[PDB]
Amino acid sequence: NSKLNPWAVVGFIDAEGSFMVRVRKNSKYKTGWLVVAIFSVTVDKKDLFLLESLKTFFGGLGSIKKSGNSTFSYRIESSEQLTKIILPFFDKYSLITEKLGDYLLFKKVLELMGTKEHLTQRGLEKIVSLKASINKGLSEELQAAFPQCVPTPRPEINNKNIPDPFWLAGFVSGDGSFKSILKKSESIKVGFQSILVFQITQHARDVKLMESLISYLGCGFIEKDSRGPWLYYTVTNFSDIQGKIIPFFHQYKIIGSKYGDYQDWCKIALIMQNKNHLTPEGLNEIRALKGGMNK
């Protein structure tokens, strides 16, 4: 239908999905805590349809909740069903970013939950350990409840290459940026120039992936923020954009709202090429060239 490509999904999750372990106080349990494993994705209301798609893609599992005012989240939080359906998926269609690190720790948490070890003090602790290593780790409340807690070290995995072009479409769908800047012309005559920029932003921990985009798309360069750990894969060459970026993503489509921006960006590219005319300086050089071609 508009049934999503499986690698697009993984691209999208690498960019924007959360593997969460929720650990709250609860008097009904022997340890005094409730553990809940959560697969979750949150977007602006303009991407509600993308949440609906994704839910459908996972068999209709989980819930879509309006978080508040202008956001929505898709989450699955039954551990039976994460184990039956989500784990086999991500074990087959593998994540490639540091997100994959989160996925593997998330999966140790679920294995302990299938054994029901999570209800024991000991199992509880191992899980707070595993949680400490997912993403930003332990909240101030949880650090204070488990001061004796050592995070589980992240397993430090291997060369993970882009697995399918559909992955990158998914990935760019969250982490990706199609821009158009209007500047003054560098000329006597007042005129305007559109500059287009395709850009991917990512934390520097995913550097191997970022560097690899240059071969993968056949263009662009890397830039590092001088002030923190941010890398920008940028394409600004207009041929490359016409010739490589626009053809790629026309075949291997952006999903969600941002496809609309890609479309507008493509339209601006036609207008740049068709509704322009030569500067007086450009007119001059071409006149001289023609004013001595073919003697």
TrEMBL record:
Amino acids binding Mg(2+) 1: 15-16, 175
Keywords tagged on the record: Calcium, Metal-binding
Domain of life of the organism encoding this protein: Eukaryota
UniProt binding sites for Mg(2+) 3: 16, 174
Residues that, per the record, bind Mg(2+) 2: 15, 175
GO cellular component terms listed in the entry, alphabetical order: mitochondrion
List of residues binding Ca(2+) 4: 102, 134
Protein name per the record: Homing endonuclease LAGLIDADG domain-containing protein
Organism of origin: Sordaria macrospora (strain ATCC MYA-333 / DSM 997 / K(L3346) / K-hell)
Taxonomic lineage from the root: Eukaryota, Fungi, Dikarya, Ascomycota, Pezizomycotina
Residues represented out of the complete protein: 118 to 412 of 432
